[PDB]
């Protein structure tokens, strides 16, 4: 909402259209380590956030941040490499501006990915978790991307989030994981957003556990929210880049400056999976 005016999203949308002969259908937001999806595209046309009209520029991780328009597995994409984060100082209305613009680009689906810690013991690092739901902690406190005057032009005042993670795409994804014959069934669970750049303490992991979160991370929830607000089909996965220590026999460390699951091929499986899934994302054509 706030900070930008509808014409900002307009201007930015039209500029992007008047600058890429591409017209996307699926918008993909790559989390840390899953930036590689950008190589799978063809017809790729790269834009640095910086150069696009009202697009939040990166603060430091620019060296991982640009918008790549291409084609992935028979689907016109618009990939966002290096998403924005609240912990980077971005107000949420900047963190989600891209989703808003995507929609105006004709985008009707958003697949959000991210790297998260494994709250659920079942999770093995490297596990890919289909996001079934989310606990939007900063949202409970007011840090919700929709705070401010609602633009009935993008959507309602009180969007329903109960149905955020497209049930359809989740069934398809669980199937496709199977069709691929991967063995380890695509994990699935609730994702809990938590801001602040620092990592959870043991006692905090336990509340995230209690609350019912399966994987903890610092992004995605606001994009899922302004996406649904616009009526974008949304589904996503989180790459369990590590397991959070629930007991005080902590020791073990797993910074971004580590990120080794995503600092490895675990992330590669997610990229290909997401690529395969382009084939299960309904076309705007429908065509019977």
Binding residues for ligand MSG, per CB under 6 A?
32, 85, 115-117, 194, 199-200, 216-219, 241-242, 244, 254, 256, 259
Respond yes or no: is residue 115 known to be catalytic: yes
270: closest CA among 175, 177, 132? Answer: 177
Output the smallest distance, CB 223 to ligand MSG, in A: 13
**Residue 22 annotated as binding?**
no
Name the active-site residue from 87, 150, 195, 254: 87
Is 84 labelled as part of a ligand binding site?
A: yes
Helix axes 221-230, 97-104, angle to 10 degrees: 30
Minimum gap (Å) between residue 169 Cβ and ligand MSG:
22
Check residue 248 and report its DSSP letter. Answer: S
Closer by beta carbon to ligand MSG, 96 or else 242: 242
Catalytic residue among 44, 88, 150, 204: 88
| Catalytic (active site) residue 175 | no
80 is catalytic: no
> Is 88 designated active site?
yes
242 tagged catalytic = yes
* Residue 208 C-beta: closest distance to ligand MSG, Å: 8
The reply to whether 85 sits in an annotated binding site is yes
Is 256 in the active site?
yes
Task: Of 135, 156, 138, 130, give the one whose Cα is nearest residue 234.
Answer: 130
Return the number of the residue (262 or 281) whose C-beta is nearest ligand MSG. 262
- Does residue 83 contact residue 105 with C-beta atoms inside 8 Å? no
- The catalytic position among 85, 103, 134, 229 is 85
Residue of 27, 76, 116, 218 marked catalytic: 218
> What is the C-alpha separation between 176 and 196, in angstroms, rounded?
35
Nearest-CB residue for ligand MSG: 117
The smaller minimum CB distance to ligand MSG, of residues 49 and 71, is found at 49
Q: What are phi and psi of 141, to 5 degrees?
A: -100, 0
Per residue, what are the HEC states of 169-238?
A: HHHHHHHHHHHCCCCCCCEEEEEEECCCCCCCCHHHHHHHHHHCCCEEECCCHHHHHHHHHHCCEEEEEE
Cβ of residue 189: shortest distance to ligand MSG, in angstroms? 14
Q: Which of 219, 227, 266, 275 is catalytic?
A: 219
66-72 and 42-48 beta bridge pairing: antiparallel
Is residue 254 flagged as an active site residue? no
- How many whole angstroms separate alpha carbon 78 and alpha carbon 102? 8
Task: Give the integer Cα–Cα distance in Å for 97 and 108.
Answer: 15
Catalytic (active site) residue 278: no
CA distance 82 to 245: 27
Q: Judged by CB, which is closer to ligand MSG: 245, or 276?
A: 245
Positions at the binding site:
32, 63, 83-85, 87, 115, 200, 218-219, 242, 256
Residues assigned a catalytic role:
32, 63, 85, 87-88, 115, 218-219, 242, 256
């Amino acid at each position: 909402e706030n900070g930008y005016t509808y014409e900002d999203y307009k201007n930015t949308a039209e500029w992007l259209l008047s600058h890429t002969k591409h017209r996307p259908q699926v918008a993909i937001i790559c989390g840390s380590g899953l930036g590689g999806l950008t190589d799978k595209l063809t017809q790729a046309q790269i834009f640095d956030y910086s150069e696009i009209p009202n697009f939040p520029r990166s603060t430091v991780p620019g060296h991982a941040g640009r918008l790549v328009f291409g084609f992935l597995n028979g689907r016109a994409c618009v990939m966002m490499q290096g998403r924005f984060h609240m912990y980077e100082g971005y107000p949420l209305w900047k963190v989600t501006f891209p989703v808003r613009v995507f929609h105006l680009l004709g985008v009707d689906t958003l697949v959000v990915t991210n790297a998260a810690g494994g709250l659920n013991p079942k999770f093995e690092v490297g596990d890919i978790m289909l996001i079934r739901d989310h606990i939007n902690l900063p949202g409970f406190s007011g840090q919700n991307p929709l705070r401010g005057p609602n633009d009935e032009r993008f959507g309602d005042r009180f969007p329903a989030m109960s149905d955020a993670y497209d049930r359809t795409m989740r069934q398809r994804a669980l199937s496709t994981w199977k069709q691929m014959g991967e063995q380890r069934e695509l994990q699935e669970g609730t994702y809990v957003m938590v801001a602040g750049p620092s990592f959870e303490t043991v006692a905090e992991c336990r509340v995230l556990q209690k609350l019912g979160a399966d994987a903890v991370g610092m992004s995605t929830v606001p994009e899922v929210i302004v996406a649904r607000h616009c009526g974008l089909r949304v589904f996503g996965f989180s790459l369990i880049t590590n397991k959070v220590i629930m007991d005080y026999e902590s020791l073990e460390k797993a910074n971004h400056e580590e990120v080794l699951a995503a600092g490895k091929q675990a992330a590669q499986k997610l990229e290909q999976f997401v690529s395969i899934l382009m084939a299960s994302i309904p076309l705007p054509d429908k065509a019977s």
